[PDB]
């Protein structure tokens, strides 16, 4: 649904009932409100992402108040299985911060991964489906949790060769890649 | 999740549908600089109340232990109690949550490979819990070297096969202060 | 002086002695509970603990009755208790909420004290002499105390103890069976 992402839009990768998709998580204009309507599971996954994103912005740019003050809107497209919903977690943080800083995310980036309150990156599933979806969407850098590593190299070489892959353990690491 | 836990983060031992699990309680700020607690983990009301019990006690305990530290009274904190324990077992996360708070507030991390279970009263009394075998199993599977239990679960722990119970350093406690002293040994005694 | 539904007599430890205090639940004006008779954060949470446990406990024993989950309620807990004795009115509150929900008065001639946990444990409290003496000054010949305060009770002069029917309790359900025979 985008070629060059505006501020607050991050390509995440989703595991659907038929296969893999590339879904744009969106944030626009303290509160967070969330549409695409998921069940409470998404909602909490979002409030932990929301609180990690707030603290991260306090620590990175003590200066910036946008997250702690604004009335933000989170949109997560419907299509992900229930179980896959929180793996948008690192995509949700990235959008908040991309809004917060009025700064678009790096072009050609996709990520998946659950985030914890302190910011640990948790493994997810649908590695294949998602990695296939980044390829078809023409992404060339992909970011994945560190215990999903095997899962990445278990895929065909056709899928993986060419791909700039990062395996992360903590959010901060994703933050650098998305934001030079 | 962690091998070394940062501040605000504590290993708690849970009784689940499937068996046991070592779970990480996490705490952090969400606004900078009167305070509040936001709680997540998909909690029913009882559990929400359980977290409030730990918050109130933690605030009371810090006022006395570090009478200069206003961090819990003025701050806006998030608490995540990760999912796992049955409804019945949810209260047992209380000292864990107490410890998590005090760890964030004091900026001191918990002693390594510590895990704990026990319900906390409004005066810091530690009540007996269930799932002790599942919980020690989880500690063992998770590499835990030191388990802190309620003194009233002594008999549940002794009546376990010795190879489960083998290799753990175990402290049985009656009050929270005992559980603070095992977690924060280079904090000041009392 | 017959307790109407939602009124329980509680024993309080006050800095100069012992007092008897009527805890009071009424309908006022997803339910809600507003508390008065104001006390610090601890006595407030003790109230919250009791309200949460009494809704669980009523759900468990009376599936059909939605009163505690529907009604907007005022808890009055009279002043006087010290801070240290703050969580001691726990079982008394719970008992008023339940009285009121079953529209069932608490038995006559009864006072209680004790902290309640969410799992329904009754915990020991201080001030057992002063409270026992309060019961006695108020006419009460049947009183409900935590199990771990047994010691405390029998360390009293036989003169105080003599004639008082006493129930030592571990779990709130024991208090229910006593208060609502």
From Swiss-Prot, chain B:
Entry similarity comment: Belongs to the peptidase S16 family.
Subunit structure: Homohexamer. Organized in a ring with a central cavity. The ATP-binding and proteolytic domains (AP-domain) form a hexameric chamber, while the N-terminal domain is arranged as a trimer of dimers. DNA and RNA binding is stimulated by substrate and inhibited by ATP binding. Interacts with TWNK and mitochondrial DNA polymerase subunit POLG.
Expression sites by tissue: Duodenum, heart, lung and liver, but not thymus.
UniProt gene name: LONP1
Record organism: Homo sapiens
Comment on protein domains: The Lon N-terminal domains are crucial for the overall structure of the protein, maintaining it in a conformation allowing its proper functioning. The AP-domain (ATP-binding and proteolytic domains) has a closed-ring conformation in the presence of AMP-PNP and its N-terminal entry gate appears closed. Upon ADP binding, it switches to a lock-washer conformation and its N-terminal gate opens.
Disease implicated: CODAS syndrome: A rare syndrome characterized by the combination of cerebral, ocular, dental, auricular, and skeletal features. These include developmental delay, craniofacial anomalies, cataracts, ptosis, median nasal groove, delayed tooth eruption, hearing loss, short stature, delayed epiphyseal ossification, metaphyseal hip dysplasia, and vertebral coronal clefts.
Residue stretches making up the Lon proteolytic domain: 4-186
Annotated phenotype, changing residue 15 to A: Has low basal, but normal stimulated ATPase activity, and retains peptidase activity
Function (record text): ATP-dependent serine protease that mediates the selective degradation of misfolded, unassembled or oxidatively damaged polypeptides as well as certain short-lived regulatory proteins in the mitochondrial matrix. Endogenous substrates include mitochondrial steroidogenic acute regulatory (StAR) protein, DELE1, helicase Twinkle (TWNK) and the large ribosomal subunit protein MRPL32/bL32m. MRPL32/bL32m is protected from degradation by LONP1 when it is bound to a nucleic acid (RNA), but TWNK is not. May also have a chaperone function in the assembly of inner membrane protein complexes.
Residues of the full protein shown: 756 to 953 of 959
Record's protein name: Lon protease homolog, mitochondrial
Active site: 92, 135
Top-rank taxon: Eukaryota
Subcellular location: Mitochondrion matrix
From Swiss-Prot, chain C:
Effect of residue 88 to A: Lacks both ATPase and protease activity, but retains DNA binding activity
Effect on the protein of changing residue 13 to P: Has normal basal, but low stimulated ATPase activity, and abolishes peptidase activity
Residue ranges occupied by any Lon proteolytic domain in the UniProt entry: 2-181
Record note on what altering residue 126 to P does: Has normal basal, but low stimulated ATPase activity, and abolishes peptidase activity
Subcellular location: Mitochondrion matrix
Domain of life: Eukaryota
Stated family: Belongs to the peptidase S16 family.
Name of the protein this chain belongs to: Lon protease homolog, mitochondrial
Organism: Homo sapiens (Human)
Gene: LONP1
């Amino acid at each position: 649904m985008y070629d060059v992402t505006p501020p607050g839009v991050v390509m995440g990768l989703a595991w659907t009932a038929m296969g893999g998709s590339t879904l744009f998580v969106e944030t626009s204009l303290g509160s967070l409100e969330v549409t695409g309507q998921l069940g409470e599971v998404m909602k909490e996954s979002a409030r932990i992402a929301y609180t990690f994103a707030r603290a991260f912005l306090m620590q990175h740019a003590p200066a910036n108040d946008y997250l702690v003050t604004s009335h933000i809107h989170l949109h997560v497209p419907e299509g992900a299985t229930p179980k896959d919903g929180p793996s948008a977690g690192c995509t949700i943080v990235t959008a908040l911060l991309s809004l917060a800083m009025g700064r678009p995310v790096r072009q050609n980036l996709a990520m998946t991964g659950e985030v914890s309150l302190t910011g640990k990156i948790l493994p997810v599933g649908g590695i294949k489906e998602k990695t296939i979806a980044a390829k078809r969407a023409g992404v060339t850098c992909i970011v994945l949790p560190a215990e999903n590593k095997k899962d990445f190299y278990d895929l065909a070489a056709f899928i993986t060769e060419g791909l700039e892959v990062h395996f992360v353990e903590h959010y901060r690491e994703i933050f650098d890649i998305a934001f030079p």
